[PDB]
Write a protein that binds this ligand. Structure first.
Ligand SMILES: Nc1nc2c(ncn2[C@@H]2O[C@H](COP(=O)(O)OP(=O)(O)CP(=O)(O)O)[C@@H](O)[C@H]2O)c(=O)[nH]1
Ligand SMILES: [Mg+2]
Ligand SMILES: [Mg+2]
Ligand SMILES: [Mg+2]
Ligand SMILES: [Mg+2]
Ligand SMILES: [Mg+2]
Ligand SMILES: [Mg+2]
Ligand SMILES: [Mg+2]
Ligand SMILES: [Mg+2]
Ligand SMILES: [Mg+2]
Ligand SMILES: [Mg+2]
Ligand SMILES: [Mg+2]
Ligand SMILES: [Mg+2]
Ligand SMILES: [Mg+2]
Ligand SMILES: [Mg+2]
Ligand SMILES: [Mg+2]
Ligand SMILES: [Mg+2]
Ligand SMILES: [Mg+2]
Ligand SMILES: [Mg+2]
Ligand SMILES: [Mg+2]
Ligand SMILES: [Mg+2]
Ligand SMILES: [Mg+2]
Ligand SMILES: [Mg+2]
Ligand SMILES: [Mg+2]
Ligand SMILES: [Mg+2]
Ligand SMILES: [Mg+2]
Ligand SMILES: [Mg+2]
Ligand SMILES: [Mg+2]
Ligand SMILES: [Mg+2]
Ligand SMILES: [Mg+2]
Ligand SMILES: [Mg+2]
Ligand SMILES: [Mg+2]
Ligand SMILES: [Mg+2]
Ligand SMILES: [Mg+2]
Ligand SMILES: [Mg+2]
Ligand SMILES: [Mg+2]
Ligand SMILES: [Mg+2]
Ligand SMILES: [Mg+2]
Ligand SMILES: [Mg+2]
Ligand SMILES: [Mg+2]
Ligand SMILES: [Mg+2]
Ligand SMILES: [Mg+2]
Ligand SMILES: [Mg+2]
Ligand SMILES: [Mg+2]
Ligand SMILES: [Mg+2]
Ligand SMILES: [Mg+2]
Ligand SMILES: [Mg+2]
Ligand SMILES: [Mg+2]
Ligand SMILES: [Mg+2]
Ligand SMILES: [Mg+2]
Ligand SMILES: [Mg+2]
Ligand SMILES: [Mg+2]
Ligand SMILES: [Mg+2]
Ligand SMILES: [Mg+2]
Lengths: 81, 205, 369
RNA sequence: GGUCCAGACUCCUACGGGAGGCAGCAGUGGGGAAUAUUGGACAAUGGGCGAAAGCCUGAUCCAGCCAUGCCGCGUGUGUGAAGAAGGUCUUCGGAUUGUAAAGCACUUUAAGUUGGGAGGAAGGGCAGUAAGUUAAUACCUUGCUGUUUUGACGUUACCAACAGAAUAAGCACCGGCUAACUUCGUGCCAGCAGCCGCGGUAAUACGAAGGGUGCAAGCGUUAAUCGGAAUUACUGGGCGUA
RNA sequence: GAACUGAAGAGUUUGAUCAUGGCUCAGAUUGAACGCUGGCGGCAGGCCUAACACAUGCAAGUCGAGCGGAUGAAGGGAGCU
């Protein structure tokens, strides 16, 4: 199906994550249809921990996209703040 | 790496002061600085344009003790910037942490300030920085670690910085040995005999 | 900090290798060459301006002039590895290793086959042994490691190394044929190796028999039977019929008075290469006989000049294992080349040192070649 | 990493009879100037199944090896003139190596030893509580609370203490192009060489030694592409005799 | 307020000169290799040749809340002991 998951960039021992909407049967870092934010595990300083585009997330949720567990937690974390 | 060895040979080869000793006694009465180093010191031997460009670039490099690859990096970044890369190069070279420490007067020579920086005795914004390439930003408050402020070298070099000519772009508090780097000096403030146009001509080739 | 004029003489540091010249020695001494030449002439052997001298005289002249000296080790890596190699304690008895020697067709492969109940003599191209084989056998008295060697005169070198790692030699001689040239070669090898000899007269089932001329023949060769003076035990066997083999084995194991404490198995293992070959599917494979310590799977091993860590370790009949006792023969995989027989293998337990030492050895090996 | 048919090539066999496909991850032989470990874990992100615990995952996350590249840091710092001894050159006076060394006084980055020490962690189990679910305070879904539980990397990043200058410089070049010069050997030899070209008795060009110049954990050589080449010329060339 | 701003020549045909014209050099780059030498770390890269042949391990399984069936603990215990 169409799912929202995390694509890993960054570098060794310093991960960075892209919130990506994809077809489920793709490589973790391969094709995507849209990126709708990002999540920074380390952050620190002037960096932001995570950011999300609410409109795009809602539109893709309304089309039947199924978020992952981590993405499901992060979405409500962003909504809470 | 780093250049380790005789330091009065460089002055003789370049033919100028090229401050490399503590400056306590003098420069003339240690190396008879009027002959080129080596067996054939008395020969004059005028040199071509390429020789002049090479001597100027080597003179600048030998004053800050920077090797060739890092000098290439500095030149590239200066050319990438705006406003007359020739003076941007000196603007960049004056912001090095070891050079800043030397200007503030905690070291006798550039090498001594470099060893102070490397051996974890200098804190830039209140945390230790031991890289003798850290570009000091205007307004940073360089200091000395409280466990190392009673070293004889700093106090000994303080008066030597007292009589060398005021820089008039950094400030220092002597009791706490802590100073502020107001801004990078303008091209006029530096010695107006380092003709950087030769460097620019050499590298643009 | 002021400048003070020195008062006494100057002393330097002198670096002396295996050889040195008077001119360069004086150069390190900051003295003239003529003065040291006349100094040498005045005391002892005269020297030339460019004469090469040894370590001893160089150290003598360095010590008499007062300068500190230190000798240079031309093989510092090797001695550093040896000193850092190993040190352990404890001691446990090990299974004996016994090699079999004799003349051609005197019946040694048949003897080993009856002992192991294996009948390898049926195979073998041409009916003659051409390879040195090692077998670990569970006899009715204990555990033994047998080494079968070819008897032909063309494998003399292969016999020599066979006597280098045995500590006991069984000399088989045929009753009907008596003393033959390869018997003399075998006794010479045994005497050179400083190893006890147990003689076995074979083919006693033949009607000819006559197992007494061999006694005089071996006595003339400085091997005395149990009677008379008494050096080595004689025993009549029949190999094929299997009569007297029990007594031969008991006599062999009676030579367990040599104690043979193989040190702890907990020490890093050492061994000697016995049989090296190349396999199209698993690379260079080395059959090595452990001497002491223990060899474990996934261990960094330096053998000859080839190094490498053991990917796999088989026993004689396949069936991969993970351990190797003090005197067990094993086939190891993982080296980067085929070693030659007679080389020593040692567990280094430090990969870097093994690497530069092995490259070191390979380089001088190419230079020597 | 499925089926059937045919083919080439290996193999097992008790001789009747079957099996195989590393251009998946490690690995071997071979070819080559030349390119690495039969490693750890599903802790994180994903994927398959399940309802849920959970199971699988050579994807992935991590380790091993190699100056292969890019970047950064060390191999000490200050004082120190009898301008030591030695080497080299010389007009035999001296000059140079050279404050360089020695001596004197400082500091401990990195490596060494020891003690502290995050972040990668979202969740799962249990009990209670509040909403909705109907017809129902039940089961179930969701909030919250309390307790418990999770890391291969890993002896993590990092921080502190200890002794001492101790553990750590090489390569190419020096006739012009092109920064850097003199001696000693050899004599159209031995040799060098990108192009001009050096060598036949005073060779700054061969081979060494002193000195110097470039780079620097690298330095040179070889191979290859573009540039310089306006030398395929659109930008931007020419054709009387080149 | 920024997203660019940039272009060098030399040696060699002659007794000497100008031109034409080829050869060569000074720069930047490699999935490099070889020679000499070699302290540390961070981040990357690592069969370009034989789509040559492959020994041995692992790389694709899950669902008992779809279904028969066989293995059937803990226990309630009973009986003889
Ligand atoms: N009569 C008799 N014949 C024997 C005896 N032992 C061996 N043989 C025979 O002698 C022949 C050779 O014996 P073998 O054991 O092959 O000799 P070998 O020493 O191995 C020969 P090589 O030196 O090459 O290894 C065989 O055919 C065997 O049958 C014995 O005790 N008695
Ligand atoms: Mg992909
Ligand atoms: Mg792809
Ligand atoms: Mg570097
Ligand atoms: Mg035999
Ligand atoms: Mg025959
Ligand atoms: Mg015979
Ligand atoms: Mg290997
Ligand atoms: Mg396959
Ligand atoms: Mg088929
Ligand atoms: Mg077929
Ligand atoms: Mg077929
Ligand atoms: Mg295959
Ligand atoms: Mg493979
Ligand atoms: Mg392929
Ligand atoms: Mg190979
Ligand atoms: Mg090959
Ligand atoms: Mg290689
Ligand atoms: Mg590979
Ligand atoms: Mg997982
Ligand atoms: Mg189950
Ligand atoms: Mg695994
Ligand atoms: Mg590295
Ligand atoms: Mg190399
Ligand atoms: Mg490489
Ligand atoms: Mg002198
Ligand atoms: Mg440290
Ligand atoms: Mg944690
Ligand atoms: Mg610790
Ligand atoms: Mg020149
Ligand atoms: Mg040369
Ligand atoms: Mg000459
Ligand atoms: Mg030349
Ligand atoms: Mg020369
Ligand atoms: Mg080279
Ligand atoms: Mg090339
Ligand atoms: Mg080319
Ligand atoms: Mg080229
Ligand atoms: Mg063109
Ligand atoms: Mg070209
Ligand atoms: Mg042009
Ligand atoms: Mg045109
Ligand atoms: Mg033209
Ligand atoms: Mg026309
Ligand atoms: Mg014509
Ligand atoms: Mg031309
Ligand atoms: Mg001419
Ligand atoms: Mg080469
Ligand atoms: Mg090499
Ligand atoms: Mg080498
Ligand atoms: Mg390929
Ligand atoms: Mg291939
Ligand atoms: Mg499995
Ligand atoms: Mg179901």
């Amino acid at each position: 199906m169409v799912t929202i998951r995390l694509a890993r960039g960054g570098s060794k021992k310093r991960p960075f994550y892209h919130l990506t909407v994809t077809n489920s049967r793709n490589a973790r870092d391969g094709r995507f249809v849209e990126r709708i934010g990002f999540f920074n595990p380390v952050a620190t300083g002037g960096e932001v921990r995570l950011s999300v585009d609410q409109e795009r997330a809602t539109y893709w949720l309304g089309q039947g996209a199924q978020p992952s567990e981590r993405v499901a937690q992060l979405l409500k974390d962003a909504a809470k703040a | 790496a780093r250049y380790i060895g005789p330091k009065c040979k460089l002055s003789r080869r370049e033919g100028t002061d090229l401050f490399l000793k503590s400056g306590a006694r003098a420069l003339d009465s240690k190396c008879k600085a009027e002959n080129v180093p080596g067996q054939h010191g008395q020969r004059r031997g005028r040199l071509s344009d390429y020789g002049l460009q090479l001597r100027e670039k080597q003179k600048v490099r030998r004053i800050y003790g920077v090797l060739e690859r890092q000098f290439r990096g500095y030149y590239q970044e200066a050319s990438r910037r705006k406003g007359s890369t020739g003076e941007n190069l000196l603007q960049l070279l004056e912001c090095r942490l070891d050079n800043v420490v030397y200007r503030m007067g905690f070291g006798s020579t550039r090498s001594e300030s470099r060893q102070l920086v490397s051996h974890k005795a200098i804190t830039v914004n209140g945390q230790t920085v031991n890289i003798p390439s850290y570009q000091v930003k205007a307004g940073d408050v360089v200091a000395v670690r409280e466990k190392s402020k009673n070293q004889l070298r700093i106090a000994q070099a303080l008066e030597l910085c007292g009589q060398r000519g005021r820089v008039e772009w950094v400030e220092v508090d002597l009791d706490k040995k802590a100073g502020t780097f107001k801004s990078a000096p303008a091209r006029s403030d530096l010695s107006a005999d380092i003709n950087e146009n030769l460097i620019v001509e050499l590298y643009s080739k | 900090h002021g400048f003070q004029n020195p008062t006494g003489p100057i002393v330097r540091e002198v670096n002396i290798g295996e050889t040195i010249t008077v001119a360069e020695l004086a150069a390190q001494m900051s003295v003239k060459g003529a003065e040291v030449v006349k100094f040498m002439f005045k005391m002892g052997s005269p020297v030339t301006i460019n004469q090469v001298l040894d370590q001893e005289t160089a150290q003598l002249v360095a010590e008499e002039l007062g300068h500190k000296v230190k000798l240079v080790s031309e093989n510092a890596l090797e001695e550093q590895l040896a000193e850092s190699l190993k040190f352990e304690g404890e001691a446990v008895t090990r299974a004996p290793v016994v090699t079999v020697m004799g003349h051609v067709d005197h019946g040694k492969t048949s003897l080993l086959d009856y002992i192991r109940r294996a009948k390898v003599a049926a195979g073998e191209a041409g009916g003659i042994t051409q390879h040195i084989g090692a077998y670990h056998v569970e006899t009715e008295r204990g555990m033994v490691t047998f080494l079968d060697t070819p008897g032909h005169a063309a494998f003399t070198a292969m016999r020599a190394r066979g006597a280098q790692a045995t500590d006991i030699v069984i000399l088989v001689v045929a009753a009907d044929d008596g003393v033959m040239p390869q018997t003399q070669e075998a006794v010479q090898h045994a005497k050179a190796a400083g190893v006890p000899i147990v003689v076995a007269v074979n083919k006693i089932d033949k009607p000819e028999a006559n197992p007494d001329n061999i006694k005089n023949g071996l006595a003339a060769l400085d091997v005395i039977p149990e009677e008379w003076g008494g050096d080595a035990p004689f025993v009549p066997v029949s190999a094929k019929l299997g009569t007297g083999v029990d007594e031969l084995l008991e006599a062999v194991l009676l030579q367990a008075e040599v104690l043979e404490l193989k040190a702890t198995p907990s020490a890093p293992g050492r061994g000697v290469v016995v049989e090296s070959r190349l396999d199209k599917g698993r690379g260079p494979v080395a059959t090595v006989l452990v001497q002491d310590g223990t060899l474990r799977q996934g261990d960094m091993v330096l053998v000859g000049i080839n190094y490498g860590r053991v990917r796999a370790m088989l026993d004689e009949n396949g069936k991969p294992i993970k351990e190797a006792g003090p005197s067990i023969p094993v086939e190891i995989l993982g080296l980067d080349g085929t070693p030659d027989a007679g080389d020593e293998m040692t567990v280094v337990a430090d990969e870097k040192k093994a690497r530069e030492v092995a490259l070191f050895r390979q380089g001088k090996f190419r230079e020597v070649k």
